[PDB]
Amino acid sequence: PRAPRTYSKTYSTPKRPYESSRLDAELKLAGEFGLKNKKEIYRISFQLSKIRRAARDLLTRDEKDPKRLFEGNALIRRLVRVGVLSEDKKKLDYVLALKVEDFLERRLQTQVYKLGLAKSVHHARVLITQRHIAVGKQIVNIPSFMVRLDSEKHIDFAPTSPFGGARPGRVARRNAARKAEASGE
Amino acid sequence: RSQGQINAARRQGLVVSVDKKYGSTNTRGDNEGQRLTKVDRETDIVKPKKLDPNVGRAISRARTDKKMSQKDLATKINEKPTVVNDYEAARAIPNQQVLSKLERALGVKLR
Amino acid sequence: GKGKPRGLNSARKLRVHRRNNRWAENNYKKRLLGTAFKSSPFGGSSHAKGIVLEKLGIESKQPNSAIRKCVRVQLIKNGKKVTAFVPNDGCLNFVDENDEVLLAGFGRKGKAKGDIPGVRFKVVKVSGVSLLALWKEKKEKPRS
Amino acid sequence: MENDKGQLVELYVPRKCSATNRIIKADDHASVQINVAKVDEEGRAIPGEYVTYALSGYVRSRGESDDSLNRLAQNDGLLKNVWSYSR
Amino acid sequence: GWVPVTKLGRLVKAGKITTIEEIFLHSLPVKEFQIIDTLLPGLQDEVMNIKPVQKQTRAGQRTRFKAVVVVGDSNGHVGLGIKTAKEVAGAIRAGIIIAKLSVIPIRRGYWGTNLGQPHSLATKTTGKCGSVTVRLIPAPRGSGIVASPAVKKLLQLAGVEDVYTQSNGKTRTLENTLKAAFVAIGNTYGFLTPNLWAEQPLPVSPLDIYSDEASAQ
RNA sequence: UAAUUGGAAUGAGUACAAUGUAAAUACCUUAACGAGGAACAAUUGGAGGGCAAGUCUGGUGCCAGCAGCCGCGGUAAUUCCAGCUCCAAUAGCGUAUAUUAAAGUUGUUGCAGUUAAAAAGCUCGUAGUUGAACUUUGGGCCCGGUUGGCCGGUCGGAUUUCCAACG
């Protein structure tokens, strides 16, 4: 009798289960991006299929429809802000050409790797979830953070993390401890 | 080959050698797949890796006279008990995968 | 043309004609006759518990020549007697008379499966544990 | 057919039958391109200067190819009192 | 290498005809495949089905292998050829030759406002071959080819970016479905849109201009 | 085909505290401990086709069993029981029943009825469904013609403009 909590699922399983085209198209999306499983790839195509349904709905409507104009710019400026639509590609005919590749680029698990400091795309994944990377002032350990356009200057090591200073962690701290009790005294 | 450069050469380029392999995934390796063309285009007879002169004689005893039988030995390397039979003295064309499992299952370091 | 009415004031004829021809459909009839409640051995349920009465051997139909090792079971909630197949080998040793088995459908929604003639059910649990566990020696049948 | 900037697309524009105004497809092998010589004083058909008619393979199969050229050439002055409008 | 026997073959070998749209505009019957190897290079092929057909005899069964192959470069041109032969290898080689000679143009268009380089078909087109009808519907941008994995694979080589399909009949007969889709895309230039209402001056055939190069010596 | 080695990082957990809370638990913080194959060890179903992945080995011998379907097994089993290897999804995966898509196999869109299932033996006939044609054009401005002439330029036809209205 308390009001319900809305919830939804954020992915979709493909219709035909065993392909050789789709199953091997995961070469890029799992080895070249360093991903857990196919649900991280099914998640992206779900949002991307959610985008085209709204865009197809708008294109059917008349040009200079106030509904087309309002939700059109809103859909563009949301996709511009996260950096999946390029700086001037801003047209509803180009959000339909938007593919799965330039969503995984904007993930923080790759944006760490492209901005140096990671030396592997799934060395970055380990560093993120080990509470090392902070955006602005906030530590994030979610590898699917989907950074914005005014945020790439703010991926840096955390003020708490050992690689951002602040008294290195329990491995080196204990390792220096046993040389203190063996060599120091 | 194996992690020597395939991560070091992937510094923000992410595509050099990303093509698909031959594609069996349970059929054995292509260690003679190069030699298979050479015996196909050369219009004469060529000798196929003739014999096993001392890797037969010496390593049959070190493997099998120790404890084991070929019916046992071929069962742990997963080959028919006549395959090991023709690796005993002579009369085989030695391929790499069978001779590798022969080595790692019974230790004697003769290739 | 086309044998059906087309006039704009003819929705009643099309609606009653669709209704009469729905009865030729196999599952529409069973949904609206309640055949699952009255006629099916399970009372329109996925599963039912039973009581084992006898071990049966049923000859497999052509072109197979095996003996299928099933049992005869009487249900609790209905009292009806059904024949249920006992899966992969050694499980007929794990089942005995009066073990209070649990039954499921045999895959084909009320039809026989494979070369077994006239068996629409299979045993899932015996004595309340499993058959997978007993077959894989993961659990033990209670002493009864 | 063109894009927004007027640049032409549709890699070829097909011929059309001069009798029934229908597209000659790339696989209409019964279609025919009739070439008729142009003439001047004292005969002497000029080489390489034509009067051209295209007939689709539909028309020729129907048997209308003769009656079509009688109309198609009388209206161009190639004939007189051969084709009549009123049947 | 290639000694042409056809008048059209001589003009292509002599370089007097340099585009295949010259053949398609004049409906010229292509009789030898080396015409359109030197006129549409970079035209890949792929074999879509190998299945056996048998004729029974007094002594035994006569089995031989039917091959369905499709060709198309990636832009505007499609070819479908079917051939049976005693060997699988020979049927694929001979099927490719038949596939090339049946190359046709597809007409591509816009589902909506035209923003260059058409992605979809110009019209709704259907094609039937032996109880299998394949309908092709224009689709908005970003839809892709929505088709069966064999029919989609023929429209990939066609050059169609976005298209819908319906289907009917026994589509598990793979030969009749591909033949029905081949008819459906070949009818794209069959349909006369209002773009094409304008009159044209009926150009002169290259076999009729370059007559003494085509003629044998 | 691994196979021997190194320093780095971390939380799952154990917890001073504080925070949280009506009081607690838990989360979010955080002192102190907390990783080297023995563990702090991921499973669930599959490997003939549909359908991705072994014609590798041992056992059985139309037996045991598998198998949604086609099929496998009668002494060289790619299909059973195993070992190895591999595939699929993954903290989830299989099984059963129902239901929706598939299904243009319920068809208004949109089925089929000569021979595959299906045109009442034939005709009349009420409800129902369906039913030939016919009854006048006021605002202004830009565009195309079709008639009407002021206009021929010209060796019976050749361009159109200013003006009606003619829709």
Is A145 in a helix, a strand, or coil? coil
Whose C1' is closest to the CA of C19: which nucleotide?
F106
Q: Is B12 on the interface with A (CB under 8 A)?
A: yes
Put simply, the answer to whether D10 touches E192 (Cβ < 8 Å) is no
- What is the domain count for chain D? 1
Q: Is A171 on the interface with B (CB under 8 A)?
A: no
Task: Please report which helix (H) or strand (E) contains residue A73, including its range.
Answer: helix A66-81
Length of chain E: 217
Alpha-carbon distances, residue C80 vs A181, C50, C103, D83 (angstroms): 80, 9, 13, 92
Give the amino acid at C109: K
Contact E11, E210 (CB under 8 A): yes
Looking at domain E7-105, which CATH architecture does it have? 2-Layer Sandwich (3.30)
Shortest CA distance to A158 belongs to which of A110, A112, A105, A106?
A112
Q: Is E104 on the interface with D (CB under 8 A)?
A: yes
Shortest CA distance to A105 belongs to which of A82, A130, A139?
A82
What ranges make up the beta strands (E) of chain D? 32-37, 50-55
* Resolution of the experimental model, in Å, one decimal: 3.0
Question: What's the CA gap between E115 and E113, in Å, rounded?
Answer: 6
**Domain boundaries along the sequence of chain A:** 17-185
Is B4 in a helix, a strand, or coil? coil
The answer for residues whose C-beta is within 8 angstroms of residue E50's C-beta and 6 or more apart is E65, E66, E67, E88, E91, E92
Question: What's the CA gap between D32 and D28, in Å, rounded?
Answer: 9
Alpha-helix runs per DSSP H in chain C:
11-22, 26-33, 35-38, 91-94, 132-135
Task: Give the range of the structural domain holding residue D8, as residue numbers without chain letter.
Answer: 1-87
Question: What's the CA gap between B103 and C1, in Å, rounded?
Answer: 83
Smallest CA–CA distance, residue A114 to chain B, in Å, is 6
CB atoms within 10 A of CB C1: 4
Question: What's the CA gap between A103 and A122, in Å, rounded?
Answer: 17
Backbone phi and psi for residue A110, each to the nearest 5 degrees, phi listed first: -100, -35
Is D52 in a helix, a strand, or coil? strand
Question: What's the CA gap between D52 and D76, in Å, rounded?
Answer: 11
Put simply, the answer to whether D4 touches E116 (Cβ < 8 Å) is yes
Which bases on strand F have an atom closer than 7 Å to a protein beta carbon?
A: 1-3, 7-11, 29-30, 33-35, 45, 47, 51-58, 62-74, 80-81, 83-91, 95-100, 103-109, 111-113, 119, 128-131
Q: How was this structure determined?
A: cryo-EM
Question: What's the CA gap between E76 and E155, in Å, rounded?
Answer: 10
User: Which residue's entry shows tokens 């007094």?
Assistant: E58
Beta-ladder partners of C102? C49, C125
Q: Is E99 exposed, middle or buried (0-12, 13-18, 19+ CB in 10 A)?
A: buried
DSSP string, chain E: -----SHHHHHHHTTS---THHHHHHTPPP--GGGTTSSS-S-EEEEEEEEEEEEE-SSSEEEEEEEEEEEE-SSSEEEEEEEEESSHHHHHHHHHHHHHHT-EE--EE-SSS--SS--EESS-EEEEETTEEEEEEE--TT--B-S-TTHHHHHHHHT--SEEEEEES-TT-HHHHHHHHHHHHHTTTTS--GGG-S----PPPHHHHSHHHHS--
Question: What's the CA gap between C126 and C144, in Å, rounded?
Answer: 11
Q: Is D34 on the interface with E (CB under 8 A)?
A: no
Which token pair is C48?
A: 């039912």
Put simply, the answer to whether E200 touches D13 (Cβ < 8 Å) is yes
Question: What's the CA gap between A109 and E168, in Å, rounded?
Answer: 47
**Domain boundaries along the sequence of chain E:** 7-105, 108-187
Contact E201, E166 (CB under 8 A): no
- Which chain E residue shows the shortest CA-CA distance from A63? E113
Q: How far does CA A41 lie from the centroid of its chain?
A: 11
DSSP string, E86-144: SSHHHHHHHHHHHHHHT-EE--EE-SSS--SS--EESS-EEEEETTEEEEEEE--TT--
Beta-ladder partners of A155? A135
Query: Which residue in B5, B12, B15, B16 has the most chain A C-beta atoms within 10 A of its own C-beta, making it the best mutation to test that interface?
Result: B12
Which token pair is E124?
A: 């709704």
Cα angle A34, A38, A44 (rounded to 5 degrees) comes to 85
What is the CA B101 to C1' F82 distance in angstroms? 21
Q: Is E198 on the interface with D (CB under 8 A)?
A: no
Question: What's the CA gap between A146 and A112, in Å, rounded?
Answer: 11
Length of chain D: 87
For residue D16, give the DSSP letter. Answer: B
Which token pair is A164?
A: 């951002």
Cis check for the bond before E29: say yes or no (omega within 30 of 0). Answer: no
Alpha-carbon distances, residue B49 vs B81, B82, B93, E119 (angstroms): 22, 19, 6, 58
What ranges make up the beta strands (E) of C3-118? 47-56, 70-75, 81-85, 102-105
Contact E48, E174 (CB under 8 A): yes
Question: What's the CA gap between C99 and C126, in Å, rounded?
Answer: 6
Helix axes A39-60, A66-81, angle to 10 degrees: 150
Contacts 24+ apart (CB under 8 A), A99-102: A99/A48, A100/A29, A100/A41, A100/A44, A100/A45, A100/A48, A101/A28
Length of chain B: 111
Looking at domain E108-187, which CATH architecture does it have? 2-Layer Sandwich (3.30)
Q: Is it the case that chain E and chain A have 3 or more CB pairs lying under 8 Å apart?
A: yes
Helix axes E151-158, E174-186, angle to 10 degrees: 30
- Tell me how many residue pairs between chain D and chain E have CB atoms under 8 A apart: 84
Give exposure, C11-45, as e/b (b: 16+ Cβ within 10 Å): eeeeeeeeeeeeeeeeeeeeeeeeeeeeebbbeee
Contact D68, D55 (CB under 8 A): yes
What ranges make up the beta strands (E) of A31-172? 133-135, 138-139, 155-157
Q: Is D66 exposed, middle or buried (0-12, 13-18, 19+ CB in 10 A)?
A: exposed
Whose C1' is closest to the CA of A172: which nucleotide?
F8
Beginning with the edge strand found earlier in the chain, give each strand of the sheet holding A133-135 in spatial order: A138-139, A133-135, A155-157
Shortest CA distance to E118 belongs to which of E53, E50, E195?
E195
User: Which residue's entry shows tokens 């029934």?
Assistant: D20
What is the CA C73 to C1' F120 distance in angstroms? 51
What is the CA E200 to C1' F146 distance in angstroms? 29
Q: Is E194 on the interface with D (CB under 8 A)?
A: no
Length of chain A: 185
Reading phi first (left if > 0) and then psi (alpha if -120 to 50, else beta), residue E177 is in alpha
